[PDB]
Amino acid sequence: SSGIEIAKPFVTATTNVLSTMAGIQPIPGQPYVKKNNVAKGDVSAVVGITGHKNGSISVTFTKQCAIAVVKAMLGDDIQDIIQDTKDAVGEVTNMISGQARAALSEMGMTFQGATPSVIMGDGHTISHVTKSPVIAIPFKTNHGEFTVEFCLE
Template identity: 50%
Template sequence: MSPDLAKPFINATKHVLSATAALEVVAGPPYVKKDKIACGCVSALIGITGDKKGTFCISFDKNTAVHIVRHMLGDAIEDVVQDVQDAMGEITNMISGHARVGMVSMGLKLQGSTPSVIMGDNHSISYRASAQAIAIPFSCQAGKFTLEFCFD
């Protein structure tokens, strides 16, 4: 898998979280993920089809997820679990969409499924590809999260 595929995901993540939650995020160096254990306790996954098939996922730690939701909704959080699930799914959908637009310039046309959100400590991520996932750690004033993608 080409390391250039990480660039659209990094750019999309910075853009979406800046626009939706006023967060300045910093990407760490991408690495090959050796296992399927999520890097956080809230993960949103999107299946990818088109020129490549695979999975896109973002895993947030609890504090980061709640911080992002509070910035998106103000203090209007009524049901923390439901609001976090909805917001993380929507954030992941927006990042995936922006990244897929960025991949068009690389000659790739991709479509994304509706996001699925998994919550809980030490949950695993099922990838729709046989290749190993690329993980990109991010940090911001809200905390840490990890973006992962895997394509055949």
């Protein structure tokens, strides 16, 4: 009904991508239906999906976690935080989209994926515009937290 029942493909994709690319040992918590109208954080990414239903996948990182991801993927010494954040988080997001949609296809649901966007600025908010509930999955890592959100309508 809410979409919480199909959280697994999104959670597994997120865990696998962050593990592989960043080595930050992501640990998902329990999915929940978001009751707040915003995700608040420091680096976010978002990518639309289309299919039998249309929706979106986002990830909102704490500053520490986004920095750790960028350092793990491109090296401890950060060349240009804006460009490297765009590139590293953008690739992570493309990979989460590809892997989550591959998992969904194996469950008989084909989705296409749009191009991601990366948002920066301390304490920005991102809000999904949808008639449906938004499902959030919080994560712990070795270097701070992030949350994955998705919706389908």
